[PDB]
Design a binder for this molecule. Structure first.
Ligand code: HEM
Length: 465
């Protein structure tokens, strides 16, 4: 390929980054922010300023990688450093996380990265026999509540009940603990939401006027002191509930305190936060796919479960071709976590589709994942939600281009990489979610809005089997 100069610029000091931030949040929105510049520069690789800049991030300057050929450099731990960039060009105060740099912020070259990631692998494996029954019990109660609410109101707010369900499910599956039996009671979703906001506010908009938002959430960090007491309630829950897991932390040579802050983070931030975005998005996209698709899913799911003597098992799920494909298509079409960063460790030559580009050691690389996973040079019908996309031998080959987990779907998270520790768990619970819906309902209708993190979604009809 021809070597091209990386197009784009960072504009004026102070003023450049602020105007780019306004485009990003207000005047364009993330997707059009990136696409308008792809068009202008005639390039899927270019220089751009990223939020938050201001007083929160020291340096907003990045090289953006916006196609599925260039983007995977962000996975290569010999090319990029992945230290302290889980949230991008700033890092939330460690006062938010017990004074520890949590696993998500650690480069694989750090010894505690290996230890802590092994801890989470153990958490997931040891939970294996609890996931099915706890999912089916907690989500059954959720759909019961949504039916109740639909009968009362003519619509049922999915997110408003599902956030509690997801936390209860995780507490029961991971720690064999019902939060209703503890001091947390039903307060966890509110506590976690505030704490996550204190971490992520510089990257988020709530729809308030920019005159209010800019000074209040985009310029300076919210003080961690204001969420410390909330965080302490969560910590005491994890400390008291995670006994069996803490035994393994002891064996791995991790302090009880460090282990507990890490379990809190993986459970509340990575898992529950991830599910908070993913599940409503799934309900939205599957809802939009239409009743013929719903009927095909119901037919497949019910037939397979019947073939399996009414027992839902991992092997039965493997028979559910359309179900597996629809889950992968949700993750392709709308990756729940869209921003991945990496700092070049050495001089690199990054190949796009039609040119190569040279980046210097120390440059911050950034990828907006939906542009890599909806890349029309990789996927046909790239901007269409295609339920059956991954069905069959040929469809399955395309999984190497599904990147939700911060690596190819065909690859395995390891202590040597920064791929999502919960990769297999997420795909499993997403499948269980679709299964639970269509074993109960023939089809459904939705009403939808936006949310700081993804979508808000109401059911307006739930057609029982
Ligand atoms: C739908 C839910 C989830 C989504 C969308 C998601 C997505 C991601 C993404 C995109 C990253 C890469 C972060 C980066 O370096 O930019 C990541 C990392 C990580 N995730 Fe997940 N995740 C989810 C669930 C989980 C679960 C269930 C676990 C349970 C252990 C988990 C644990 C982690 C950990 C520990 C890392 C850092 C890995 C490392 O340091 O090597 N996540 N996740």
């Amino acid at each position: 390929l021809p070597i091209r100069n990386i197009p784009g610029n960072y504009g004026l000091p102070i003023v450049g980054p602020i105007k780019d931030r306004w485009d990003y949040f207000y005047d364009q929105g993330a997707e059009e922010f990136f696409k308008s510049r792809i068009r202008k520069y005639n390039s899927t690789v270019y220089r751009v300023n990223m939020p938050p800049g201001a007083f929160i991030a020291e340096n907003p300057q990045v090289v953006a990688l916006l196609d599925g050929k260039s983007f995977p450099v962000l996975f290569d731990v010999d090319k990029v450093e992945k230290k302290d960039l889980f949230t991008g060009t700033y890092m939330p105060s460690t006062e938010l996380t017990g004074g520890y740099r949590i696993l998500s912020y650690l480069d694989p070259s750090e010894p505690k990265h290996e230890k802590l990631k092994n801890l989470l692998f153990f958490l997931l494996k040891s939970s294996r026999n609890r996931i099915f029954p706890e999912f089916q019990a907690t989500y059954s109660e959720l759909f019961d509540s949504l039916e109740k609410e639909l009968s009362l109101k003519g619509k049922a707010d999915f997110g408003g009940s599902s956030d509690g369900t997801a936390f209860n499910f995780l507490a029961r599956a991971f720690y064999g603990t019902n939060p209703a039996d503890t001091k947390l009671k039903a307060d966890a979703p509110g506590l976690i939401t505030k704490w996550v906001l204190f971490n992520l506010h510089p990257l988020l908009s709530i729809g308030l006027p920019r005159v209010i938002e800019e000074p209040l959430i985009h310029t300076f960090s919210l003080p961690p002191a204001l969420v410390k007491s909330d965080y302490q309630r969560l910590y005491e829950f994890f400390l008291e509930s995670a006994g069996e897991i803490l035994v393994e932390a002891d064996k791995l040579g991790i302090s009880r305190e460090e282990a507990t802050h890490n379990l809190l983070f993986a459970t509340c931030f990575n898992t529950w936060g991830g599910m908070k975005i993913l599940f409503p998005n799934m309900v939205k996209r599957i809802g939009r796919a239409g009743h013929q698709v719903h009927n095909r899913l119901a037919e497949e799911i019910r037939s397979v479960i019947k073939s399996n003597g009414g027992e839902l098992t991992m092997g039965a799920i493997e028979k559910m071709e359309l179900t597996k494909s629809v889950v992968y298509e949700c993750l392709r079409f709308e990756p729940p976590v869209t921003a991945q960063y990496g700092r070049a460790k050495k001089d690199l030559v990054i190949e796009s589709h039609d040119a190569a580009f040279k980046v210097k050691a120390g440059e911050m690389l950034y990828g907006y994942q939906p542009l890599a996973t909806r890349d029309p040079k990789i996927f046909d019908r790239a901007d269409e939600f295609v339920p059956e996309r991954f069905v069959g031998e040929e469809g399955e080959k395309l999984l190497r281009h599904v990147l939700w987990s911060n690596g190819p779907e065909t690859e395995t998270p390891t202590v040597g990489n920064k791929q999502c520790a919960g990769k297999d768990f997420v795909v499993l619970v997403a499948r269980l979610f679709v299964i639970e819906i269509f074993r109960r309902y023939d089809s459904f209708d939705i009403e939808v809005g936006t949310s700081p993190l993804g979508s808000s979604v109401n059911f307006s009809s739930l057609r029982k089997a």
